[PDB]
Design a protein around this ligand. Structure first.
Ligand SMILES: O=C(N[C@H](CO)[C@H](O)c1ccc([N+](=O)[O-])cc1)C(Cl)Cl
Ligand SMILES: [Mg+2]
Ligand SMILES: [Mg+2]
Ligand SMILES: [Mg+2]
Ligand SMILES: [Mg+2]
Ligand SMILES: [Mg+2]
Ligand SMILES: [Mg+2]
Ligand SMILES: [Mg+2]
Ligand SMILES: [Mg+2]
Ligand SMILES: [Mg+2]
Ligand SMILES: [Mg+2]
Ligand SMILES: [Mg+2]
Ligand SMILES: [Mg+2]
Ligand SMILES: [Mg+2]
Ligand SMILES: [Mg+2]
Ligand SMILES: [Mg+2]
Ligand SMILES: [Mg+2]
Ligand SMILES: [Mg+2]
Ligand SMILES: [Mg+2]
Ligand SMILES: [Mg+2]
Ligand SMILES: [Mg+2]
Ligand SMILES: [Mg+2]
Ligand SMILES: [Mg+2]
Ligand SMILES: [Mg+2]
Ligand SMILES: [Mg+2]
Ligand SMILES: [Mg+2]
Ligand SMILES: [Mg+2]
Ligand SMILES: [Mg+2]
Ligand SMILES: [Mg+2]
Ligand SMILES: [Mg+2]
Ligand SMILES: [Mg+2]
Ligand SMILES: [Mg+2]
Ligand SMILES: [Mg+2]
Ligand SMILES: [Mg+2]
Ligand SMILES: [Mg+2]
Ligand SMILES: [Mg+2]
Ligand SMILES: [Mg+2]
Ligand SMILES: [Mg+2]
Ligand SMILES: [Mg+2]
Ligand SMILES: [Mg+2]
Ligand SMILES: [Mg+2]
Ligand SMILES: [Mg+2]
Ligand SMILES: [Mg+2]
Ligand SMILES: [Mg+2]
Ligand SMILES: [Mg+2]
Ligand SMILES: [Mg+2]
Ligand SMILES: [Mg+2]
Ligand SMILES: [Mg+2]
Ligand SMILES: [Mg+2]
Ligand SMILES: [Mg+2]
Ligand SMILES: [Mg+2]
Ligand SMILES: [Mg+2]
Ligand SMILES: [Mg+2]
Ligand SMILES: [Mg+2]
Ligand SMILES: [Mg+2]
Ligand SMILES: [Mg+2]
Ligand SMILES: [Mg+2]
Ligand SMILES: [Mg+2]
Ligand SMILES: [Mg+2]
Ligand SMILES: [Mg+2]
Ligand SMILES: [Mg+2]
Ligand SMILES: [Mg+2]
Ligand SMILES: [Mg+2]
Ligand SMILES: [Mg+2]
Ligand SMILES: [Mg+2]
Ligand SMILES: [Mg+2]
Ligand SMILES: [Mg+2]
Ligand SMILES: [Mg+2]
Ligand SMILES: [Mg+2]
Ligand SMILES: [Mg+2]
Ligand SMILES: [Mg+2]
Ligand SMILES: [Mg+2]
Ligand SMILES: [Mg+2]
Ligand SMILES: [Mg+2]
Ligand SMILES: [Mg+2]
Ligand SMILES: [Mg+2]
Ligand SMILES: [Mg+2]
Ligand SMILES: [Mg+2]
Ligand SMILES: [Mg+2]
Ligand SMILES: [Mg+2]
Ligand SMILES: [Mg+2]
Ligand SMILES: [Mg+2]
Ligand SMILES: [Mg+2]
Ligand SMILES: [Mg+2]
Ligand SMILES: [Mg+2]
Ligand SMILES: [Mg+2]
Ligand SMILES: [Mg+2]
Ligand SMILES: [Mg+2]
Ligand SMILES: [Mg+2]
Ligand SMILES: [Mg+2]
Ligand SMILES: [Mg+2]
Ligand SMILES: [Mg+2]
Ligand SMILES: [Mg+2]
Ligand SMILES: [Mg+2]
Ligand SMILES: [Mg+2]
Ligand SMILES: [Mg+2]
Ligand SMILES: [Mg+2]
Ligand SMILES: [Mg+2]
Ligand SMILES: [Mg+2]
Ligand SMILES: [Mg+2]
Ligand SMILES: [Mg+2]
Ligand SMILES: [Mg+2]
Ligand SMILES: [Mg+2]
Ligand SMILES: [Mg+2]
Ligand SMILES: [Mg+2]
Ligand SMILES: [Mg+2]
Ligand SMILES: [Mg+2]
Ligand SMILES: [Mg+2]
Ligand SMILES: [Mg+2]
Ligand SMILES: [Mg+2]
Ligand SMILES: [Mg+2]
Ligand SMILES: [Mg+2]
Ligand SMILES: [Mg+2]
Ligand SMILES: [Mg+2]
Ligand SMILES: [Mg+2]
Ligand SMILES: [Mg+2]
Ligand SMILES: [Mg+2]
Ligand SMILES: [Mg+2]
Ligand SMILES: [Mg+2]
Ligand SMILES: [Mg+2]
Ligand SMILES: [Mg+2]
Ligand SMILES: [Mg+2]
Ligand SMILES: [Mg+2]
Ligand SMILES: [Mg+2]
Ligand SMILES: [Mg+2]
Ligand SMILES: [Mg+2]
Ligand SMILES: [Mg+2]
Ligand SMILES: [Mg+2]
Ligand SMILES: [Mg+2]
Ligand SMILES: [Mg+2]
Ligand SMILES: [Mg+2]
Ligand SMILES: [Mg+2]
Ligand SMILES: [Mg+2]
Ligand SMILES: [Mg+2]
Ligand SMILES: [Mg+2]
Ligand SMILES: [Mg+2]
Ligand SMILES: [Mg+2]
Ligand SMILES: [Mg+2]
Ligand SMILES: [Mg+2]
Ligand SMILES: [Mg+2]
Ligand SMILES: [Mg+2]
Ligand SMILES: [Mg+2]
Ligand SMILES: [Mg+2]
Ligand SMILES: [Mg+2]
Ligand SMILES: [Mg+2]
Ligand SMILES: [Mg+2]
Ligand SMILES: [Mg+2]
Ligand SMILES: [Mg+2]
Ligand SMILES: [Mg+2]
Ligand SMILES: [Mg+2]
Ligand SMILES: [Mg+2]
Ligand SMILES: [Mg+2]
Ligand SMILES: [Mg+2]
Ligand SMILES: [Mg+2]
Ligand SMILES: [Mg+2]
Ligand SMILES: [Mg+2]
Ligand SMILES: [Mg+2]
Ligand SMILES: [Mg+2]
Ligand SMILES: [Mg+2]
Ligand SMILES: [Mg+2]
Ligand SMILES: [Mg+2]
Ligand SMILES: [Mg+2]
Ligand SMILES: [Mg+2]
Ligand SMILES: [Mg+2]
Ligand SMILES: [Mg+2]
Ligand SMILES: [Mg+2]
Ligand SMILES: [Mg+2]
Ligand SMILES: [Mg+2]
Ligand SMILES: [Mg+2]
Ligand SMILES: [Mg+2]
Ligand SMILES: [Mg+2]
Ligand SMILES: [Mg+2]
Ligand SMILES: [Mg+2]
Ligand SMILES: [Mg+2]
Ligand SMILES: [Mg+2]
Ligand SMILES: [Mg+2]
Ligand SMILES: [Mg+2]
Ligand SMILES: [Mg+2]
Ligand SMILES: [Mg+2]
Ligand SMILES: [Mg+2]
Ligand SMILES: [Mg+2]
Ligand SMILES: [Mg+2]
Ligand SMILES: [Mg+2]
Ligand SMILES: [Mg+2]
Ligand SMILES: [Mg+2]
Ligand SMILES: [Mg+2]
Ligand SMILES: [Mg+2]
Ligand SMILES: [Mg+2]
Ligand SMILES: [Mg+2]
Ligand SMILES: [Mg+2]
Ligand SMILES: [Mg+2]
Ligand SMILES: [Mg+2]
Ligand SMILES: [Mg+2]
Ligand SMILES: [Mg+2]
Ligand SMILES: [Mg+2]
Ligand SMILES: [Mg+2]
Ligand SMILES: [Mg+2]
Ligand SMILES: [Mg+2]
Ligand SMILES: [Mg+2]
Ligand SMILES: [Mg+2]
Ligand SMILES: [Mg+2]
Ligand SMILES: [Mg+2]
Ligand SMILES: [Mg+2]
Ligand SMILES: [Mg+2]
Ligand SMILES: [Mg+2]
Ligand SMILES: [Mg+2]
Ligand SMILES: [Mg+2]
Ligand SMILES: [Mg+2]
Ligand SMILES: [Mg+2]
Ligand SMILES: [Mg+2]
Ligand SMILES: [Mg+2]
Ligand SMILES: [Mg+2]
Ligand SMILES: [Mg+2]
Ligand SMILES: [Mg+2]
Ligand SMILES: [Mg+2]
Ligand SMILES: [Mg+2]
Ligand SMILES: [Mg+2]
Ligand SMILES: [Mg+2]
Ligand SMILES: [Mg+2]
Ligand SMILES: [Mg+2]
Ligand SMILES: [Mg+2]
Ligand SMILES: [Mg+2]
Ligand SMILES: [Mg+2]
Ligand SMILES: [Mg+2]
Ligand SMILES: [Mg+2]
Ligand SMILES: [Mg+2]
Ligand SMILES: [Mg+2]
Ligand SMILES: [Mg+2]
Ligand SMILES: [Mg+2]
Ligand SMILES: [Mg+2]
Ligand SMILES: [Mg+2]
Ligand SMILES: [Mg+2]
Ligand SMILES: [Mg+2]
Ligand SMILES: [Mg+2]
Ligand SMILES: [Mg+2]
Ligand SMILES: [Mg+2]
Ligand SMILES: [Mg+2]
Ligand SMILES: [Mg+2]
Ligand SMILES: [Mg+2]
Ligand SMILES: [Mg+2]
Ligand SMILES: [Mg+2]
Ligand SMILES: [Mg+2]
Ligand SMILES: [Mg+2]
Ligand SMILES: [Mg+2]
Ligand SMILES: [Mg+2]
Ligand SMILES: [Mg+2]
Ligand SMILES: [Mg+2]
Ligand SMILES: [Mg+2]
Ligand SMILES: [Mg+2]
Ligand SMILES: [Mg+2]
Ligand SMILES: [Mg+2]
Ligand SMILES: [Mg+2]
Ligand SMILES: [Mg+2]
Ligand SMILES: [Mg+2]
Ligand SMILES: [Mg+2]
Ligand SMILES: [Mg+2]
Ligand SMILES: [Mg+2]
Ligand SMILES: [Mg+2]
Ligand SMILES: [Mg+2]
Ligand SMILES: [Mg+2]
Lengths: 275, 48
RNA sequence: GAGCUAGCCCUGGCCAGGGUGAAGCUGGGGUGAGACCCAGUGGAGGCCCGAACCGGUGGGGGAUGCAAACCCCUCGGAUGA
RNA sequence: GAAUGCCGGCAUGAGUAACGAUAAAGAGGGUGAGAAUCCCUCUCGCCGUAAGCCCAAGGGUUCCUACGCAAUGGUCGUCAGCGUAGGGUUAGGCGGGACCUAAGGUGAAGCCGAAAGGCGUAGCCGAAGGGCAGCCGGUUAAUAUUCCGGCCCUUCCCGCAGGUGCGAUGGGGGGACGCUCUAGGCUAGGGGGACCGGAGCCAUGGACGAGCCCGGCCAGAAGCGCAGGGUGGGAGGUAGGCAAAUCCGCCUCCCAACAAGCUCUGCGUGGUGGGGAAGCCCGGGUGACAACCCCCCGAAGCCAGGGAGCCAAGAAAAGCCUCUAAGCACAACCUGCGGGAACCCGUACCGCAAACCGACACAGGUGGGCGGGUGCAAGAGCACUCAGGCGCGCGGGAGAACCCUCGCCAAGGAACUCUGCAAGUUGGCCCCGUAACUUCGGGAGAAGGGGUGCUCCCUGGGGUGAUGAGCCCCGGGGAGCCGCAGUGAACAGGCUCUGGCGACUGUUUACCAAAAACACAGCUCUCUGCGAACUCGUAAGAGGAGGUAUAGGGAGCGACGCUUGCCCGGUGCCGGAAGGUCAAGGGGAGGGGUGCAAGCCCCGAACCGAAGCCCCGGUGAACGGCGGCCGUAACUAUAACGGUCCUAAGGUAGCGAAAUUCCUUGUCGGGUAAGUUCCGACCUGCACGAAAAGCGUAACGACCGGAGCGCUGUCUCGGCGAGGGACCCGGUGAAAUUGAACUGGCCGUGAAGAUGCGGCCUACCCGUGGCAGGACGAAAAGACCCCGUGGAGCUUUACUGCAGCC
RNA sequence: CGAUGUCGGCUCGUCGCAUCCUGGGGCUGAAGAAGGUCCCAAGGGUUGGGCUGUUCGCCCAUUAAAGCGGCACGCGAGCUG
RNA sequence: UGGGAGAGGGUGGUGGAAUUCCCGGAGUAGCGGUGAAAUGCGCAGAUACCGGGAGGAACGCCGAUGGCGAAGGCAGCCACCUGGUCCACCCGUGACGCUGAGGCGCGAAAGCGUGGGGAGCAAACCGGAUUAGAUACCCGGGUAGUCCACGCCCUAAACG
RNA sequence: CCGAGGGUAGGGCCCGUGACUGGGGCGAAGUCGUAACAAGGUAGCUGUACCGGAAGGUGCGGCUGGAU
């Protein structure tokens, strides 16, 4: 339920913030945080390898449980739902009857005080994690492992989900958030429900300063540079591309496919994304 | 205005100092050359 | 060679005083319930005025300089990219 | 003898410019060979959110004392940050180390690379972050939280006593955190006192006074008081915290809960130890048995890890507490007390500057803390002043031009000029009042006006205290007084109308451009299924991201509003298991060299045989492109209409002499006395046009146009005045430049612009202050321009390679 | 080309005369007044604004008149830009 | 009080028929389309046929000259929430009524905003044909939209 | 003190006029097509939307004021 502001500054006119309604605990679990080491986009050489990064708010990393087959059969109580700055989804704090505590990605509809569980015979209920083979066809899932025991990889951002389309041998057929149809092995775990905070995409940043808070530094158009810098650099006055639109490194950037041709996972993709 | 020399003893010792030179193929050739030339100081002096 | 300068990372520090008065909240009115309106409270903001601080708009001076970029008057920002 | 040659020496310019902030000097007395310049005293001026004081860096003896003045000091010098010599820096508690971790660095394991080397978990290193025990005064020429004095404290070792399952690098807790706003109680600091202590003072008309003037504290262990922080207790279950665990986590039960108890800080008090002024007298003495009290103001500091709200969601590790493990329970740990033990390095001095960075004793630059009083609404603003610190290391005269900085100006008032450039005007606070338009916030300090001092009287509410007094804070009404003038000095918007561009706050060519450029939220296309794409790297390995399509990369466009048309023939990209071409390789018809032969050796057709290209499609917010001629209406004109040629398709809406219009000052209208600019129109748009976006748009702008009001030395048109220079005298004393010079005008001549040649003319010798016409004056081996089979950056369907990709 | 700064303006002049005005003339299709045209004459004089960077030009209000040229399109070691 | 009929409204489920696209099989020279054609599609294997799958939208027969609502309007089936309405009985209140300027709410389609969705259809647009032309009628393509949610718009031959 | 009015500044209503521009009315015999009236030769009309020299065309829903 995105929140608006009155136009009492030029930037507040368009700014929108999340409503934070589902959040019930506004300080993180101390035993689950780690320092999240900012890179500035620099690699172990000191070199910028992702441009225009740096300068965002400090964050602590909240450890998330992307396995959940760790505690088959052990139910847990949803203790709280919290803000996580490392991701668009909210995170749910789980109190296992074990006494163990863990974070998961908070699906949509998950309520504080309800119980979730993981395993081959967990109920088909929002927040539960089962091998994909034991989830009925048609079910909406998130936090989908891509290969057994390797960790949840697919449908993790706010609002996203995958749907189970059908079965074929040891594999199930998912329609991923991008609309691609793909075979994922049946022993891969997944979590009933869609990721929460679907309003996330409607947030209007509002001002340049907001991008700066997020660690996003200003992006410079190639057309704004000189030929030492960019295919689009130079020209007297403004200038159209004057060549096929290109990246700073010269490769074409309107249409040119880039997935590796002979990639082994091609056997497991039924339909490439559309639209 | 702010000029280019802004002394800093730790900076001086960590950058041009004896142990910095010995740590590196080029830095050792620096020490080797300044010895062959007979330099009285092989390395910038700094109070530490 | 990044003790100048450019970006980033870590850890600290700094921003006189005044102004405007968002949301919310409380109460009143309103209605079938409402939206909503009014008053008080409240204290938001790449908000306003202005020092420190960061700048360098216009003019004058300087031009074997006080100075290999300075001086005077004036001017921009000053809770934030 | 020349190379703008090289090295050195010495000239010229010249007794010339200058002597480094216009905060400022005068005199007396010392000293000395010598004194504007050193010392002392009195007077004067300057800083005082500093130009004062304390830290940090950096510097490295510059510190203190004696002797000294060749050089250094922009003059002088008896002086000095200078020469010589002697002295001077004292810590268990301050800072760093024998503690902790941050980025990063390094790196047993391990990974990679021709070599050199590159990575890399743990671990180690790494601080201005965490942690940790000292406050006040006195003393030296010079050190002091260091020596001394008083009162406190820490750790280690050993012993005594008491208590306990003791025990760790392992588990757990805690350490431990943002931004804005903020409560209560205090402390720092400050103001006042008709109270307390004090040397003294009465002047020049008055005052012996509730007069003047000075001072009225600081540190303190236990205990106590006030104000705060931190924290539930018990029991049972237990499968999680990579062994164990009574700890922690989870479930349950009882009890406690805005408390209380326990615990820990801050402040107050507190045995006690210190300090203690003006003035007077030679740093000292005295004052002095100094007094040391009350009221008010009051932090941004303290209690603190306090409270609230908010989104961008805010280090680690050790110390410390708890748990248990081997072990050990004659040990060990905990508490209390006692004795002993407690190392290394820094400490001088400068520190917004003459000691640091700028070649200089350089008007520049340099991080943190304190930074008093009064008045001005507030404040770190402004004026003056305290403490403290200075008068800026050449002076003395003179009172020209001219320059700089400054003040004033009759009448006019932008007539100045590219331009109101510059300078006026306006200027704080309180009150009244305030337009188009608008995205409803705004535009707005719109505009425009009124008030502003002092005196007496009446009165409202708040803080402290007690409910009162006193002090303090915000006012209200009535009557008066003075001046030209009451934000009386200083600090402090000129306003409006209307266009272009860019939505906006921001960013930029350090040092000639701050903008219309860049960025920006936002829109769209496109790539990417995760060992992602992409980027850096030979690689390993990184970033992307401990992210996962509501995400990440690339590209264009650029808030928002209304929109974004037609062309896929060429280029690009996407799709197309056919067909064409197609390299190595396969295949081996059929030839050849050689040998007596077996053979050995070579060439070799069809045919099979990828990507790429050809070919068939698609695709515009991909690269891009969006016609010509001729005719036609019952006045003329112009063509809704028609004909024809070409195209891949012939520019739609909107806009248009435009930041685009050549002809051009187009034409008409507006404004003006007059308008190549401006504004509104028209449309034959040389050469607008729809995300290199089209047309608009409230708000915003040190952007760029046009106009008006206000006001002015911009101007008609100049005058006067001030100070710093210029000028003269004493001191010190440069520079570029320079073939040599005994260096005039005209008209001619000359390589075509002559002091130097010819003819004439003019002219006694040498300076000083001034002006700039000439010496084709100086400076810089012209940047323009060309030339060189000179160089470099950049581009591409130039050539040829290489990475990378297929 | 081992540098002769280049438009316009401002300031400061000075010269030529093919004379804009003022003075002296002849001819006139010169009644007068006022013109036309030519000759002599360089002593002095030759305005203030609007537009534009402009020179120039047009325009406004005047004037006896609102002259044309040279001086490195005079003059940047004189200024502006 | 006891009953009744009904596509009245809202929410959520879910059922088959058809179209399209995709995959597999089988099969060959055309299919489509018209007044006739052409564009288009098809030997790169279409049409026609069988099996599987995906997705959206509309609910055949019943069905009516029917029913319901104040109107706009409402049609598979199921559950739940909910309105209006009629009949019986003659039990209760005791004129508590009618209409209604303003106000408030509802209001087909198309359209607008923000998300989603997209099978069929189809403004715009392209192509084929017709014609003197043909910015049409007919044919082949085809984007908004048509569908869902929330918020706007408030019109009509909103007519009996 | 109040006060006719005068002055400064800013608003509100109305009238007149304006380069150019919008459509409207009218006008004996202009140019283009033929949308409507018959099934008007595509039934008409309709609200809305988009497009086109022009009437108009087309989409969506609605009306009969439609024919056979
Ligand atoms: O180059 C200059 N001028 C040269 C003298 O060497 C010459 O006088 C010149 C001036 C102007 C010019 N022009 O306008 O074309 C040409 C040459 C000066 Cl700008 Cl330094
Ligand atoms: Mg908003
Ligand atoms: Mg609003
Ligand atoms: Mg939430
Ligand atoms: Mg931790
Ligand atoms: Mg990382
Ligand atoms: Mg590294
Ligand atoms: Mg490295
Ligand atoms: Mg990048
Ligand atoms: Mg970066
Ligand atoms: Mg979150
Ligand atoms: Mg993310
Ligand atoms: Mg799989
Ligand atoms: Mg978004
Ligand atoms: Mg962030
Ligand atoms: Mg972005
Ligand atoms: Mg950009
Ligand atoms: Mg560019
Ligand atoms: Mg550029
Ligand atoms: Mg480069
Ligand atoms: Mg290149
Ligand atoms: Mg390039
Ligand atoms: Mg280009
Ligand atoms: Mg360019
Ligand atoms: Mg161009
Ligand atoms: Mg450019
Ligand atoms: Mg081009
Ligand atoms: Mg390209
Ligand atoms: Mg690539
Ligand atoms: Mg895909
Ligand atoms: Mg600098
Ligand atoms: Mg150092
Ligand atoms: Mg250092
Ligand atoms: Mg350093
Ligand atoms: Mg290094
Ligand atoms: Mg070193
Ligand atoms: Mg080596
Ligand atoms: Mg070696
Ligand atoms: Mg040496
Ligand atoms: Mg030696
Ligand atoms: Mg060395
Ligand atoms: Mg640096
Ligand atoms: Mg530095
Ligand atoms: Mg500030
Ligand atoms: Mg403030
Ligand atoms: Mg105010
Ligand atoms: Mg208020
Ligand atoms: Mg509140
Ligand atoms: Mg601000
Ligand atoms: Mg203000
Ligand atoms: Mg600066
Ligand atoms: Mg300046
Ligand atoms: Mg100025
Ligand atoms: Mg200079
Ligand atoms: Mg200055
Ligand atoms: Mg100033
Ligand atoms: Mg300001
Ligand atoms: Mg401020
Ligand atoms: Mg010779
Ligand atoms: Mg020589
Ligand atoms: Mg030479
Ligand atoms: Mg030489
Ligand atoms: Mg010599
Ligand atoms: Mg020499
Ligand atoms: Mg010499
Ligand atoms: Mg001489
Ligand atoms: Mg001279
Ligand atoms: Mg000089
Ligand atoms: Mg000098
Ligand atoms: Mg000064
Ligand atoms: Mg001065
Ligand atoms: Mg005197
Ligand atoms: Mg002297
Ligand atoms: Mg002397
Ligand atoms: Mg004197
Ligand atoms: Mg003295
Ligand atoms: Mg002061
Ligand atoms: Mg030094
Ligand atoms: Mg001397
Ligand atoms: Mg001397
Ligand atoms: Mg001597
Ligand atoms: Mg000297
Ligand atoms: Mg000097
Ligand atoms: Mg002496
Ligand atoms: Mg000393
Ligand atoms: Mg001690
Ligand atoms: Mg030791
Ligand atoms: Mg360590
Ligand atoms: Mg090894
Ligand atoms: Mg090595
Ligand atoms: Mg280190
Ligand atoms: Mg360490
Ligand atoms: Mg430390
Ligand atoms: Mg310490
Ligand atoms: Mg102490
Ligand atoms: Mg001391
Ligand atoms: Mg914590
Ligand atoms: Mg934490
Ligand atoms: Mg910290
Ligand atoms: Mg914040
Ligand atoms: Mg308080
Ligand atoms: Mg105290
Ligand atoms: Mg005070
Ligand atoms: Mg005390
Ligand atoms: Mg247990
Ligand atoms: Mg005594
Ligand atoms: Mg502070
Ligand atoms: Mg604190
Ligand atoms: Mg760590
Ligand atoms: Mg024993
Ligand atoms: Mg114990
Ligand atoms: Mg030791
Ligand atoms: Mg010391
Ligand atoms: Mg000091
Ligand atoms: Mg300073
Ligand atoms: Mg300082
Ligand atoms: Mg000094
Ligand atoms: Mg020095
Ligand atoms: Mg230097
Ligand atoms: Mg000096
Ligand atoms: Mg200095
Ligand atoms: Mg004081
Ligand atoms: Mg004030
Ligand atoms: Mg002085
Ligand atoms: Mg000074
Ligand atoms: Mg004189
Ligand atoms: Mg004055
Ligand atoms: Mg006067
Ligand atoms: Mg005057
Ligand atoms: Mg005027
Ligand atoms: Mg006037
Ligand atoms: Mg003017
Ligand atoms: Mg003038
Ligand atoms: Mg200008
Ligand atoms: Mg102007
Ligand atoms: Mg003024
Ligand atoms: Mg003022
Ligand atoms: Mg107005
Ligand atoms: Mg208004
Ligand atoms: Mg206006
Ligand atoms: Mg406007
Ligand atoms: Mg408004
Ligand atoms: Mg005003
Ligand atoms: Mg008054
Ligand atoms: Mg007075
Ligand atoms: Mg102001
Ligand atoms: Mg801007
Ligand atoms: Mg800009
Ligand atoms: Mg714009
Ligand atoms: Mg805009
Ligand atoms: Mg923008
Ligand atoms: Mg700002
Ligand atoms: Mg530059
Ligand atoms: Mg610059
Ligand atoms: Mg430069
Ligand atoms: Mg400048
Ligand atoms: Mg510029
Ligand atoms: Mg600017
Ligand atoms: Mg830029
Ligand atoms: Mg912008
Ligand atoms: Mg946009
Ligand atoms: Mg998008
Ligand atoms: Mg590579
Ligand atoms: Mg990572
Ligand atoms: Mg993205
Ligand atoms: Mg991106
Ligand atoms: Mg931009
Ligand atoms: Mg609008
Ligand atoms: Mg094309
Ligand atoms: Mg094509
Ligand atoms: Mg193409
Ligand atoms: Mg091929
Ligand atoms: Mg082209
Ligand atoms: Mg083309
Ligand atoms: Mg006719
Ligand atoms: Mg259009
Ligand atoms: Mg035009
Ligand atoms: Mg235009
Ligand atoms: Mg332009
Ligand atoms: Mg043009
Ligand atoms: Mg033109
Ligand atoms: Mg022109
Ligand atoms: Mg004209
Ligand atoms: Mg006119
Ligand atoms: Mg025309
Ligand atoms: Mg373009
Ligand atoms: Mg525009
Ligand atoms: Mg605008
Ligand atoms: Mg605007
Ligand atoms: Mg601006
Ligand atoms: Mg600006
Ligand atoms: Mg003007
Ligand atoms: Mg004016
Ligand atoms: Mg003047
Ligand atoms: Mg004077
Ligand atoms: Mg004399
Ligand atoms: Mg002398
Ligand atoms: Mg001397
Ligand atoms: Mg000679
Ligand atoms: Mg001679
Ligand atoms: Mg001579
Ligand atoms: Mg002569
Ligand atoms: Mg000649
Ligand atoms: Mg001559
Ligand atoms: Mg001569
Ligand atoms: Mg001779
Ligand atoms: Mg001769
Ligand atoms: Mg001669
Ligand atoms: Mg001669
Ligand atoms: Mg003569
Ligand atoms: Mg002289
Ligand atoms: Mg002279
Ligand atoms: Mg001269
Ligand atoms: Mg000159
Ligand atoms: Mg000359
Ligand atoms: Mg010459
Ligand atoms: Mg010359
Ligand atoms: Mg030069
Ligand atoms: Mg040369
Ligand atoms: Mg040359
Ligand atoms: Mg040169
Ligand atoms: Mg040439
Ligand atoms: Mg050649
Ligand atoms: Mg040649
Ligand atoms: Mg060449
Ligand atoms: Mg090259
Ligand atoms: Mg030349
Ligand atoms: Mg020369
Ligand atoms: Mg020269
Ligand atoms: Mg006459
Ligand atoms: Mg006559
Ligand atoms: Mg004659
Ligand atoms: Mg004359
Ligand atoms: Mg002119
Ligand atoms: Mg000219
Ligand atoms: Mg002209
Ligand atoms: Mg006359
Ligand atoms: Mg002339
Ligand atoms: Mg000429
Ligand atoms: Mg010429
Ligand atoms: Mg000239
Ligand atoms: Mg000139
Ligand atoms: Mg000049
Ligand atoms: Mg000039
Ligand atoms: Mg010159
Ligand atoms: Mg000259
Ligand atoms: Mg065929
Ligand atoms: Mg075939
Ligand atoms: Mg679908
Ligand atoms: Mg009855
Ligand atoms: Mg609809
Ligand atoms: Mg066609
Ligand atoms: Mg025909
Ligand atoms: Mg469609
Ligand atoms: Mg409706
Ligand atoms: Mg009167
Ligand atoms: Mg019809
Ligand atoms: Mg008809
Ligand atoms: Mg019809
Ligand atoms: Mg049509």
């Amino acid at each position: 339920a995105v929140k608006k502001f009155k136009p009492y500054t030029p930037s507040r006119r368009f700014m929108t913030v999340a409503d934070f309604s589902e959040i019930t605990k506004t300080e993180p679990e101390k035993s689950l945080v780690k320092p999240l080491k900012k890179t500035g986009g620099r690699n172990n050489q000191g070199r910028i390898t992702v441009r225009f990064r740096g300068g965002g708010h400090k964050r602590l990393y909240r450890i998330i449980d992307f396995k959940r087959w760790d505690k088959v059969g052990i139910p847990a109580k949803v203790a709280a739902i919290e803000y996580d700055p490392n991701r668009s989804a909210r995170i749910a704090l789980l109190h296992y009857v074990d006494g163990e505590k863990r974070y998961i990605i908070a699906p949509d509809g998950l309520q504080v005080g309800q119980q979730v569980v993981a395993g081959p015979d967990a109920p088909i209920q929002v927040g539960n994690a089962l091998p994909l083979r034991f989830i009925p066809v048609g079910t909406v899932v998130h936090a989908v492992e891509l290969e057994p025991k390797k960790g949840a990889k697919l449908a993790r951002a706010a609002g996203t989900s995958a749907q189970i389309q059908g079965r074929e041998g040891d594999y199930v057929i998912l329609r991923l958030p991008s609309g691609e149809l793909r075979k994922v092995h049946g022993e891969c775990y997944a979590t009933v429900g869609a990721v929460g905070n679907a309003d996330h995409k409607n947030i209007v940043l509002g001002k340049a300063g907001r991008s700066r808070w997020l660690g996003r530094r200003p992006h410079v158009r190639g057309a704004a540079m000189n030929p030492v810098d960019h295919p689009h650099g130079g020209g007297e006055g403004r200038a159209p591309r004057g060549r096929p639109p290109a990246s700073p490194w010269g490769w074409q950037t309107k249409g040119l496919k880039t997935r590796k041709r002979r990639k082994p996972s091609s056997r497991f993709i039924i339909a490439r994304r559309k639209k | 205005m702010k000029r280019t020399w802004q002394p800093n003893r730790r900076k001086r010792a960590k950058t041009h100092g004896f142990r910095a030179r010995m740590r590196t193929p080029g830095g050792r050739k620096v020490l080797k050359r300044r010895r062959q030339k007979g330099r009285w100081r092989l390395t910038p002096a700094v109070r530490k």
